[PDB]
PDB file of C-alpha atoms and ligand atoms in Angstrom:
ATOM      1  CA  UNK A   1     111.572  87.095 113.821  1.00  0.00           C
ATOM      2  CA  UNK A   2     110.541  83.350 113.316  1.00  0.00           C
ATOM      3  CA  UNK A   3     111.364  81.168 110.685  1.00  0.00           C
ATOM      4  CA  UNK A   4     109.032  80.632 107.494  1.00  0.00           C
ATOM      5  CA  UNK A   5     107.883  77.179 107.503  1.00  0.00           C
ATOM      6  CA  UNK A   6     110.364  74.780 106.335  1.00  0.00           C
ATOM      7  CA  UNK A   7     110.692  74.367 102.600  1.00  0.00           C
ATOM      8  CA  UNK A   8     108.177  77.941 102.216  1.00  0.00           C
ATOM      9  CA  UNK A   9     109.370  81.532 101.761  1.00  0.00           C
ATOM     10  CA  UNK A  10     106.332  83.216 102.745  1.00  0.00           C
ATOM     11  CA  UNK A  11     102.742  82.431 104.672  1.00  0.00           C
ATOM     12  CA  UNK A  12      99.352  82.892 103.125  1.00  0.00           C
ATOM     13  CA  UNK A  13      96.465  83.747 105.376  1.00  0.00           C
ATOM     14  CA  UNK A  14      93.329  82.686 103.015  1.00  0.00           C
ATOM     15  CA  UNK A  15      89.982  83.499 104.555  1.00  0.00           C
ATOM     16  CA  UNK A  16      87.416  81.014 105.091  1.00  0.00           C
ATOM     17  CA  UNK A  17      84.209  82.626 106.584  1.00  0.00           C
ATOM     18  CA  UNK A  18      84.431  86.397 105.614  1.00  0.00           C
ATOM     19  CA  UNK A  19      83.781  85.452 101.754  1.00  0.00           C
ATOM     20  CA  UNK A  20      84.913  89.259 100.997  1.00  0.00           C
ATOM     21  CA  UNK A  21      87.836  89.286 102.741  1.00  0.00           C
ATOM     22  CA  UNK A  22      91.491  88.768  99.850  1.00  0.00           C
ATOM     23  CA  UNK A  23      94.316  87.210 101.252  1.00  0.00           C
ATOM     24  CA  UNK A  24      96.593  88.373 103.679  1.00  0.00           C
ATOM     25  CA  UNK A  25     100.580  87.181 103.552  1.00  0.00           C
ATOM     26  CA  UNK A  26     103.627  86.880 106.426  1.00  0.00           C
ATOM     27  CA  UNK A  27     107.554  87.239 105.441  1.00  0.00           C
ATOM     28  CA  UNK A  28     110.078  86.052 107.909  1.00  0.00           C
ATOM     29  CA  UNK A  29     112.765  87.805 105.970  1.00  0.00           C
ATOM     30  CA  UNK A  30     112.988  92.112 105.706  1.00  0.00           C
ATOM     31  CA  UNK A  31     114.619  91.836 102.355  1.00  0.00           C
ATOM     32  CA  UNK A  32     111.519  89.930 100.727  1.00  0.00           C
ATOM     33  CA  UNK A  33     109.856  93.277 100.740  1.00  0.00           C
ATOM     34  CA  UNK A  34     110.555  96.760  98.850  1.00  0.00           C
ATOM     35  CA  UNK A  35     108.168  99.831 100.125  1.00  0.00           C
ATOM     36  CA  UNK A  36     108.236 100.866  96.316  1.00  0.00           C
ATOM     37  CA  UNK A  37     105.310 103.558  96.929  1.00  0.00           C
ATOM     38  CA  UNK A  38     104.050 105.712 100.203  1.00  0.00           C
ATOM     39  CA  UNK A  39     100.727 106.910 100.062  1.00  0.00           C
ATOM     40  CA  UNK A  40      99.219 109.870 101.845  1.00  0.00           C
ATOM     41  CA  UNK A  41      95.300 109.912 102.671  1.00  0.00           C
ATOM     42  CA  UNK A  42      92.517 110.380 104.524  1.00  0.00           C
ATOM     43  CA  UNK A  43      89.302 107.956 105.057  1.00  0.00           C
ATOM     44  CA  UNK A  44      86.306 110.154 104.090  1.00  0.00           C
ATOM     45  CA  UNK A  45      82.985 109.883 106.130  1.00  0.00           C
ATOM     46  CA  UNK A  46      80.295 107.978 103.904  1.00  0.00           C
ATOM     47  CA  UNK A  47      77.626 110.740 103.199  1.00  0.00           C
TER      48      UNK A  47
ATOM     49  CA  UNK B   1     120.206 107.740 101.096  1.00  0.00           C
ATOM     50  CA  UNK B   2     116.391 107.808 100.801  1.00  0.00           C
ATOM     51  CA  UNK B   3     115.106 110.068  98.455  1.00  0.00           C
ATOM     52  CA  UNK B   4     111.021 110.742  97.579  1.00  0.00           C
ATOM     53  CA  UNK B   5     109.623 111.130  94.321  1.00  0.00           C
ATOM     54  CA  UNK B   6     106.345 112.929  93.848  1.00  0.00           C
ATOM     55  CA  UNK B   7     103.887 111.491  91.188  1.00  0.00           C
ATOM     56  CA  UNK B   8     101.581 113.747  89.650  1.00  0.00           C
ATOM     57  CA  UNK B   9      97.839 113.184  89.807  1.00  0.00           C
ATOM     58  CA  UNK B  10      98.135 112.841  85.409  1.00  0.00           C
ATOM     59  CA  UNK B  11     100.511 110.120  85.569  1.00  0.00           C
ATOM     60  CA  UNK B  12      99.286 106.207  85.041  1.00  0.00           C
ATOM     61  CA  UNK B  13     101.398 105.302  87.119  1.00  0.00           C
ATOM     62  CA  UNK B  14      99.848 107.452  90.040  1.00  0.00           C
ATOM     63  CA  UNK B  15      96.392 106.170  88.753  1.00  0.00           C
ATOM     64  CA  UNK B  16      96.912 102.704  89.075  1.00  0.00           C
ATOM     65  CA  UNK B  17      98.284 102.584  92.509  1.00  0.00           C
ATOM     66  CA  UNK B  18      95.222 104.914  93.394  1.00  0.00           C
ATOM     67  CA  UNK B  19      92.902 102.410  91.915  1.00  0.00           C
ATOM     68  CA  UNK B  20      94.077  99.541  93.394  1.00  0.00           C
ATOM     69  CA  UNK B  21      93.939 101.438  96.965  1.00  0.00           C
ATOM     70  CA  UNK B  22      90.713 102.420  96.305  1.00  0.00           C
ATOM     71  CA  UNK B  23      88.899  99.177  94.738  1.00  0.00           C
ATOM     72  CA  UNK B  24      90.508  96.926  97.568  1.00  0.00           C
ATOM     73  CA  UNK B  25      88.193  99.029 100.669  1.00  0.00           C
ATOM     74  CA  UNK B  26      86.272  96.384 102.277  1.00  0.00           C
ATOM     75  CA  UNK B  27      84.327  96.437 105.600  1.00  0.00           C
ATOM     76  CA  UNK B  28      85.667  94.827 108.448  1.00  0.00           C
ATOM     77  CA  UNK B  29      84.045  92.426 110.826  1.00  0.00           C
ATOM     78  CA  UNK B  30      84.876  95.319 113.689  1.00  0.00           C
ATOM     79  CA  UNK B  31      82.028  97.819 112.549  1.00  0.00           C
ATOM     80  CA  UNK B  32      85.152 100.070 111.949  1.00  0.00           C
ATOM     81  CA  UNK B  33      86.554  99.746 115.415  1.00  0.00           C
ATOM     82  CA  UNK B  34      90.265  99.760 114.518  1.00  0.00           C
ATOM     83  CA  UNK B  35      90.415 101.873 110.926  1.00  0.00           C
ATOM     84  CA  UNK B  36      87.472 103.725 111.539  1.00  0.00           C
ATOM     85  CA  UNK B  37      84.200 103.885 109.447  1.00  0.00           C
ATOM     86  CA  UNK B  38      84.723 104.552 105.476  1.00  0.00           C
ATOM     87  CA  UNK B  39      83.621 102.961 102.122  1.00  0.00           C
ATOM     88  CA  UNK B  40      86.845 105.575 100.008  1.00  0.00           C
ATOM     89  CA  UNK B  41      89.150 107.588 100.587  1.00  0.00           C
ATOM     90  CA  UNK B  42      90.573 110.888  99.519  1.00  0.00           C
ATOM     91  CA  UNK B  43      94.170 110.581  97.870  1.00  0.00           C
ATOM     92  CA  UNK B  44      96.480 113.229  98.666  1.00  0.00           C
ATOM     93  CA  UNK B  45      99.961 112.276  97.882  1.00  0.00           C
ATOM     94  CA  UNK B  46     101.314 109.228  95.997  1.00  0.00           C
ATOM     95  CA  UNK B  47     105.483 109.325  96.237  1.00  0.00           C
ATOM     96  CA  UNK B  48     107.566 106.838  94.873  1.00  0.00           C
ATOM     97  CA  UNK B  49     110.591 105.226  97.198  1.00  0.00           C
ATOM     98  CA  UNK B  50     114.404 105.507  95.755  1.00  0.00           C
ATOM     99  CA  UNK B  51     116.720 103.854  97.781  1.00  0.00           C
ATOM    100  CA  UNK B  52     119.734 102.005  95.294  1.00  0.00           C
ATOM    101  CA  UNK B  53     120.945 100.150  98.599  1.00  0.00           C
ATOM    102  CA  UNK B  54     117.426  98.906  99.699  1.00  0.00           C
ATOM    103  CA  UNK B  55     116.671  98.103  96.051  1.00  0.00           C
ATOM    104  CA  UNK B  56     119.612  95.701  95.587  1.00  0.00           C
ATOM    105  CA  UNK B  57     118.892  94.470  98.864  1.00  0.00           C
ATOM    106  CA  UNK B  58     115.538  93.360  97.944  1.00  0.00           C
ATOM    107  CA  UNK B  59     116.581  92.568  94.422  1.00  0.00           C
ATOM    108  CA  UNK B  60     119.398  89.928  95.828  1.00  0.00           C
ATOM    109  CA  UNK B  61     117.121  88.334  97.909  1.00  0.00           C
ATOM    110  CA  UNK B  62     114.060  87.950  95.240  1.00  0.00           C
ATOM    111  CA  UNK B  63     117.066  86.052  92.880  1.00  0.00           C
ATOM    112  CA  UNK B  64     117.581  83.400  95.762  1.00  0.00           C
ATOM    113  CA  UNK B  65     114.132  82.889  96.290  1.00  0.00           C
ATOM    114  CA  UNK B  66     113.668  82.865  92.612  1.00  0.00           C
ATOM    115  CA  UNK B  67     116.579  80.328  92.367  1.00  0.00           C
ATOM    116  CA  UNK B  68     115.102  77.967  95.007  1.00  0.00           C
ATOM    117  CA  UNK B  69     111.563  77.841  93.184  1.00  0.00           C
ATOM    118  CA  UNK B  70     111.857  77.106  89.208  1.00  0.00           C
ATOM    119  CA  UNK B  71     113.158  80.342  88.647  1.00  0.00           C
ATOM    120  CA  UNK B  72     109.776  82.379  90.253  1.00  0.00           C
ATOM    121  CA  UNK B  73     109.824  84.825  93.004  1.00  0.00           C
ATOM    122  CA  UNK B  74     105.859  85.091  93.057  1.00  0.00           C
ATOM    123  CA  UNK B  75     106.239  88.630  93.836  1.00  0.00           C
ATOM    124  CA  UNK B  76     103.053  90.730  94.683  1.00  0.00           C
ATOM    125  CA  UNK B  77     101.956  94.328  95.386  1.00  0.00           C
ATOM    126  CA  UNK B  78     100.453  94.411  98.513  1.00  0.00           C
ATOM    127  CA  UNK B  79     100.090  96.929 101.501  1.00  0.00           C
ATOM    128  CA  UNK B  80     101.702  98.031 104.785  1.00  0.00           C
ATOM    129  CA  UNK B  81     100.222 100.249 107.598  1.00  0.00           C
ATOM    130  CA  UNK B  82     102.654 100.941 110.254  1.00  0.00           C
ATOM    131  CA  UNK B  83     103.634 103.319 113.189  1.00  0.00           C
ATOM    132  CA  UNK B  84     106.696 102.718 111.564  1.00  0.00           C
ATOM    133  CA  UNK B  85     106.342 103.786 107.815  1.00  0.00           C
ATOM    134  CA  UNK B  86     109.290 106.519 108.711  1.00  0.00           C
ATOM    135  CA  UNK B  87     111.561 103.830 109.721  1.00  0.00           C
ATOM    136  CA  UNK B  88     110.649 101.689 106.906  1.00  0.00           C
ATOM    137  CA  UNK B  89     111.410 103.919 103.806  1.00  0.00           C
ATOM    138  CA  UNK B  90     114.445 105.136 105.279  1.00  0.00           C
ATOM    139  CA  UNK B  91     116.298 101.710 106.752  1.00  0.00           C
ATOM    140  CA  UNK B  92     114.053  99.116 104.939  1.00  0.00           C
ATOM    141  CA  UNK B  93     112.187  96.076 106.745  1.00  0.00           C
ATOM    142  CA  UNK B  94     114.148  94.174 109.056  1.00  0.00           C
ATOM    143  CA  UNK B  95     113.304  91.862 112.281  1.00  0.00           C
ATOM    144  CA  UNK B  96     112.486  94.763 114.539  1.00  0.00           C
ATOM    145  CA  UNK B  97     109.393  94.891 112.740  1.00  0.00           C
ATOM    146  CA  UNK B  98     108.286  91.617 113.403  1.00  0.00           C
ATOM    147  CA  UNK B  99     104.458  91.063 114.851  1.00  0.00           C
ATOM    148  CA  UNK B 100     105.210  88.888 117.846  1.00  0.00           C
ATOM    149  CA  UNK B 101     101.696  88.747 118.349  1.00  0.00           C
ATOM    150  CA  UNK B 102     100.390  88.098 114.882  1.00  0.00           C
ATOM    151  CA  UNK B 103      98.072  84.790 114.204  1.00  0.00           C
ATOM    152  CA  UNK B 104     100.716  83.110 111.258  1.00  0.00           C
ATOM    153  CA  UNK B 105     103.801  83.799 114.340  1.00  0.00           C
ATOM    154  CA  UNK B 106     106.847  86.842 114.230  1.00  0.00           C
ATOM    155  CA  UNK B 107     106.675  87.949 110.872  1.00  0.00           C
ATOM    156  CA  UNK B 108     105.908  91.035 108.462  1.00  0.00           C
ATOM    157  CA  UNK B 109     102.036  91.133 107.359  1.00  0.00           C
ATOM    158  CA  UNK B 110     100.820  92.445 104.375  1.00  0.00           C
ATOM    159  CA  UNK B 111      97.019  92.704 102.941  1.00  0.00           C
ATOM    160  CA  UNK B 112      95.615  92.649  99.558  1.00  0.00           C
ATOM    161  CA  UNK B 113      92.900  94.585 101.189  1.00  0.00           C
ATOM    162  CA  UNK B 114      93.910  98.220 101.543  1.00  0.00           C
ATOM    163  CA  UNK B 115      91.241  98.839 104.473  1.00  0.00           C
ATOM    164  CA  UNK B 116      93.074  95.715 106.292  1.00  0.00           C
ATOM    165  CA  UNK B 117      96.562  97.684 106.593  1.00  0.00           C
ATOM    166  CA  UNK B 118      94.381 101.022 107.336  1.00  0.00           C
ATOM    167  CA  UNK B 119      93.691  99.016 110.690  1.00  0.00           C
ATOM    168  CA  UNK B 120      97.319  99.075 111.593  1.00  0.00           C
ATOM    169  CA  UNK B 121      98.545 103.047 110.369  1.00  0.00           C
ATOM    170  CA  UNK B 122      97.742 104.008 114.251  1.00  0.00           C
ATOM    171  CA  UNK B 123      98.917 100.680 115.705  1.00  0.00           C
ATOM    172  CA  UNK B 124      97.754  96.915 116.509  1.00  0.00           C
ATOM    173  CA  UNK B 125      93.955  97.198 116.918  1.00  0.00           C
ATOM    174  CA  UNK B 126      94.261 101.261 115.740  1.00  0.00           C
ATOM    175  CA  UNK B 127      96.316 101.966 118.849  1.00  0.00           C
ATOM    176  CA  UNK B 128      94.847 105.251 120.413  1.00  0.00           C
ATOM    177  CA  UNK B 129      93.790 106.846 117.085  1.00  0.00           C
ATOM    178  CA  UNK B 130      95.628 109.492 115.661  1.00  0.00           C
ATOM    179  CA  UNK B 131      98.074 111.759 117.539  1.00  0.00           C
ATOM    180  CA  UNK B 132      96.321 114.795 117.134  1.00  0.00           C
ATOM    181  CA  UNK B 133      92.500 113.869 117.955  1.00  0.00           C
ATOM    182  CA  UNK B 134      92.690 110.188 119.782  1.00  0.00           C
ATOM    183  CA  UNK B 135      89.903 109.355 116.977  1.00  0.00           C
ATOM    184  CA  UNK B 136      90.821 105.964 115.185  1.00  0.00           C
ATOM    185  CA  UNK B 137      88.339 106.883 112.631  1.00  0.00           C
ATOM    186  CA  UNK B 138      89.661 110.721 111.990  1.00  0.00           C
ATOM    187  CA  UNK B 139      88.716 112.099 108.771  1.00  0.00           C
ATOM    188  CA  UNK B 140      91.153 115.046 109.187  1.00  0.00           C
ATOM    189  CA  UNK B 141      94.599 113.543 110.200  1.00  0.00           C
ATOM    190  CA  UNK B 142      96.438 112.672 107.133  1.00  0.00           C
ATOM    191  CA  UNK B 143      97.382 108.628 107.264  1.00  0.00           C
ATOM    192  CA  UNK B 144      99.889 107.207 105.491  1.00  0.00           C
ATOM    193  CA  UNK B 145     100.202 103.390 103.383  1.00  0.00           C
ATOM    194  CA  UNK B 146     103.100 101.536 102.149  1.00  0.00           C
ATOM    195  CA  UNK B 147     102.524 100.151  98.446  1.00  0.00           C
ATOM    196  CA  UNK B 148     104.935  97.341  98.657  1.00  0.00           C
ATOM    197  CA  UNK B 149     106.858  94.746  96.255  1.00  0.00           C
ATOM    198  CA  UNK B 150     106.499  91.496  98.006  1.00  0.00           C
ATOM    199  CA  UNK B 151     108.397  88.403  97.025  1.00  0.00           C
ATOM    200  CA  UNK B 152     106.579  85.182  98.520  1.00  0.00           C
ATOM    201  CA  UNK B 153     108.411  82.129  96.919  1.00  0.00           C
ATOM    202  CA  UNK B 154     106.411  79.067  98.095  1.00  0.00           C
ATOM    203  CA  UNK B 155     103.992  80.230 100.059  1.00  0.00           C
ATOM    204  CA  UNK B 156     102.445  78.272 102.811  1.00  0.00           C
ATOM    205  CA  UNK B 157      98.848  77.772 102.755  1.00  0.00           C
ATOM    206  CA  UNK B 158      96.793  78.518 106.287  1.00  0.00           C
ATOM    207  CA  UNK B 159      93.371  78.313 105.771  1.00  0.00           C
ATOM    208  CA  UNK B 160      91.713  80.373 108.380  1.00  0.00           C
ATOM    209  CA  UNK B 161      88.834  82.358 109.923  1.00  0.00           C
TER     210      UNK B 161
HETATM  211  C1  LIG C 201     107.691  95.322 117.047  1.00  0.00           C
HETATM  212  N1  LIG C 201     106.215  95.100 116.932  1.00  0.00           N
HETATM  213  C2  LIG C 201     105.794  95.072 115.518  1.00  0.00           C
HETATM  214  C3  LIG C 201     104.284  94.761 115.437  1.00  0.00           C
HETATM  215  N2  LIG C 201     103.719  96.035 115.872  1.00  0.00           N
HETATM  216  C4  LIG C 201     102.933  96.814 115.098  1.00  0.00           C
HETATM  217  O1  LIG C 201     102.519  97.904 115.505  1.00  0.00           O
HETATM  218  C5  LIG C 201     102.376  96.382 113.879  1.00  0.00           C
HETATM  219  C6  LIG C 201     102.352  97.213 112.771  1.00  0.00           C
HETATM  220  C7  LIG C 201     101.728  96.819 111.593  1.00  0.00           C
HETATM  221  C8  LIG C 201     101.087  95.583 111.483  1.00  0.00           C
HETATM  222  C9  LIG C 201     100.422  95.183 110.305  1.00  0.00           C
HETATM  223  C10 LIG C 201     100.360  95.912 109.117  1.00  0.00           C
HETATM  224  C11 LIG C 201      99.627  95.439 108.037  1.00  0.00           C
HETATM  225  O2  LIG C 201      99.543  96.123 106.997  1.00  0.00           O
HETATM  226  C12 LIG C 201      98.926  94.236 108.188  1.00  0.00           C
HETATM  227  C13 LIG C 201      98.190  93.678 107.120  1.00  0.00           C
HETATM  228  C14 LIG C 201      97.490  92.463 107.284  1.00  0.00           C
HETATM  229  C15 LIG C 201      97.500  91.825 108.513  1.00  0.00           C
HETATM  230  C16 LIG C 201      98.211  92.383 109.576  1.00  0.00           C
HETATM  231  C17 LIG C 201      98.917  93.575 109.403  1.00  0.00           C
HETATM  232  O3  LIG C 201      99.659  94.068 110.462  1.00  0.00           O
HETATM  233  C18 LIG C 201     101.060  94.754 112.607  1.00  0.00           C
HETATM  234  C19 LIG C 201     101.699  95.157 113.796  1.00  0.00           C
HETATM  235  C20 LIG C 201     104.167  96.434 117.266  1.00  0.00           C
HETATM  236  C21 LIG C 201     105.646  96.412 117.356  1.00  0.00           C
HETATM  237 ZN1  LIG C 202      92.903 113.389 113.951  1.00  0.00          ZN
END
């Protein structure tokens, strides 16, 4: 594990070229998250 | 001391975190390489996570974040796909799980984009696809997402492609 960037908790990856794409986000720390719900699916095949 | 709670289809609470899984599907700049090729998918299960010890655990650390940023944790809801999921809902995240290869260094990556952790159920890249058929874009193997509380404090800004 590294360390977050000094005085930061967290990273934010914003995109800038994929204009669609949301944000994507980096913790250096296991107790900053909770896995609150699990989720069990398939991906369908477009028709 | 993990125990799973089933939500029914009726309940709001079920149909938000459905909706948010759903309306966050985006296509990906690998044609579907890694999470295979899909505009929706089909919910089967949504079960929520009780675990008092992992709770406090999470709930100490969010009040010293909070505590070193005017009393805000800037917590989010935000998704994890893992080989690991089993690991995580049972013993929690920890350093084992960080991505030594990842592009923002060794950390734990989430996605607002539910399609963008979808990538990562199977492995880095989509590994081999799923156990049963090698296919990374199987539409019969049942996959499995983490719907997690995140707590980013001040979050460093990388601007990136
Ligand atoms: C100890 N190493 C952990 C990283 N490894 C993973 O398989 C791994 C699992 C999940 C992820 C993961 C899961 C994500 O949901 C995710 C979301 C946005 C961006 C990147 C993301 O990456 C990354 C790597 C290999 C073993
Ligand atoms: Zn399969």
């Amino acid at each position: 594990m590294a360390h977050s960037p000094p005085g930061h908790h967290s990273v934010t990856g914003r995109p800038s070229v994929n204009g669609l794409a949301l944000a994507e986000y980096v913790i250096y720390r296991g107790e900053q998250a909770y896995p609150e719900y699990l989720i069990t699916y398939q991906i369908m095949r477009p028709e | 001391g993990t125990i799973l709670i089933d939500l029914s289809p009726d309940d709001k609470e079920f149909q938000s975190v459905e909706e948010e899984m759903q309306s966050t599907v985006r296509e990906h700049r690998d044609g579907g390489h890694a999470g295979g090729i899909f505009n929706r998918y089909n919910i089967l299960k949504i079960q929520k996570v009780c675990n008092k010890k992992l709770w406090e655990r999470y709930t100490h650390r969010r009040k010293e974040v909070s505590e070193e940023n005017h009393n805000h944790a800037n917590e989010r809801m935000l998704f994890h796909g893992s080989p690991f999921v089993n690991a995580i809902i049972h013993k929690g995240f920890d350093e084992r799980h960080a991505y030594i290869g990842g592009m923002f260094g060794a950390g734990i990556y989430f996605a607002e984009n539910s399609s963008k952790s979808n990538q990562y159920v199977y492995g880095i890249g989509g590994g081999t696809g799923c156990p049963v058929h090698k296919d990374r874009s199987c539409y019969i193997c049942h996959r499995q997402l983490l719907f997690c509380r995140v707590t980013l404090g001040k979050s460093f800004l990388q601007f990136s492609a």
